[PDB]
Amino acid sequence: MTMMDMNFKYCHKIMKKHSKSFSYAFDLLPEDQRKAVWAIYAVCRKIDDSIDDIQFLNQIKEDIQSIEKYPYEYHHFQSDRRIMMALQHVAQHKNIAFQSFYNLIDTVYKDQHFTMFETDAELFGYCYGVAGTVGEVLTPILSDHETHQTYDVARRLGESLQLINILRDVGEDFENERIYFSKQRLKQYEVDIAEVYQNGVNNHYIDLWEYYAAIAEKDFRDVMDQIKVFSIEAQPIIELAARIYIEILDEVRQANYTLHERVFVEKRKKAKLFHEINSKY
Numbered sequence: 001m002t003m004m005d006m007n008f009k010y011c012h013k014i015m016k017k018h019s020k021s022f023s024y025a026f027d028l029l030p031e032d033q034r035k036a037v038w039a040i041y042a043v044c045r046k047i048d049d050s051i052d053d054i055q056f057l058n059q060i061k062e063d064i065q066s067i068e069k070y071p072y073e074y075h076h077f078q079s080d081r082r083i084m085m086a087l088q089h090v091a092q093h094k095n096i097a098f099q100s101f102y103n104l105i106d107t108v109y110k111d112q113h114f115t116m117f118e119t120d121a122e123l124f125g126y127c128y129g130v131a132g133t134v135g136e137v138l139t140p141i142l143s144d145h146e147t148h149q150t151y152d153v154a155r156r157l158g159e160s161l162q163l164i165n166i167l168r169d170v171g172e173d174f175e176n177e178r179i180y181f182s183k184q185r186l187k188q189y190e191v192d193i194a195e196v197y198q199n200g201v202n203n204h205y206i207d208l209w210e211y212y213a214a215i216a217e218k219d220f221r222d223v224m225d226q227i228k229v230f231s232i233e234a235q236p237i238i239e240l241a242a243r244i245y246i247e248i249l250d251e252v253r254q255a256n257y258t259l260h261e262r263v264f265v266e267k268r269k270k271a272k273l274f275h276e277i278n279s280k281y
């Protein structure tokens with residue numbers, strides 16, 4: 001394998017370490033598109049994890065800026081060379097939405113002084129910032145002729161996936177001093193996350209959970225309805241990634257909404273879902 005191959009392999013490793021679901025699905029893509037997703041995904045992970053000060057994140061942002069300004073120049077990257085070298089390689093062949101990386105970065109800067117979200121509007125704006133932006137960056141990789149609707153579908157999918165993630169992680173997020181449900185919705189449903197964490201679920205909580213799960217599932221259906229904005233090769237894969245991810249909701253239900261472990265979709269169940277999906281492709 002070439003030096004660049006090694007860079008992409010490292011990007012793969014970061015993706016698979018962070019998400020078996022997304023790696024499971026996206027490693028099914030043809031080589032070229034597969035590798036581009038690894039790099040973009042790895043950059044987004046490095047960004048999301050960075051603060052845990054801002055130094056490295058400033059360096060990531062500066063590296064991304066160098067690539068945007070001078071895609072074909074050799075740069076001595078300040079942050080992670082392997083990842084930036086791969087991103088640069090991708091950017092030389094695809095139209096990367098750099099402002100989307102900057103939106104993600106800005107959101108991550110903001111998460112430092114995390115304050116709970118007043119309304120759902122603020123929560124959904126967060127979902128765009130950390131996840132819709134990722135859909136936007138992935139768009140040119142996963143579609144042939146991108147237009148406003150391609151970006152919109154990808155953005156909505158990203159956002160739904162984030163919401164599902166939040167719904168899986170209420171417990172662990174609370175332990176790390178984060179509550180992503182909005183005050184508006186929490187107060188409406190009469191839920192105190194600390195209280196549920198100490199005492200177990202009740203009917204108020206389950207109702208609030210199901211309110212957000214309803215939103216996620218409906219967005220999923222609307223994304224599926226528009227699957228054809230994506231390249232034919234990427235369609236079943238994107239569908240798969242979504243389906244695997246939405247199955248998480250049922251795992252949460254089957255575990256009775258527990259706030260004390262991370263539920264998951266077995267590897268063998270992921271294979272079943274994929275089989276299901278191709279019985280129509």
Ligand SMILES: CCCCCCOc1cccc(Cn2ccc(O)c(C(=O)O)c2=O)c1
Nearest residue numbers: 019130131134135138154157158161162165
């Ligand atoms: C057309 C392209 C389809 C769009 C794909 C978007 O992929 C993304 C991007 C960003 C976030 C998520 C949700 N997600 C999943 C696992 C996870 O661990 C976290 C976390 O750690 O928060 C998390 O947010 C998914």
Ligand SMILES: [Mg+2]
Nearest residue numbers: 018019020165
């Ligand atoms: Mg995940």
Ligand SMILES: [Mg+2]
Nearest residue numbers: 048130131162
């Ligand atoms: Mg994220």
Ligand SMILES: [Mg+2]
Nearest residue numbers: 165166169173
């Ligand atoms: Mg989470």
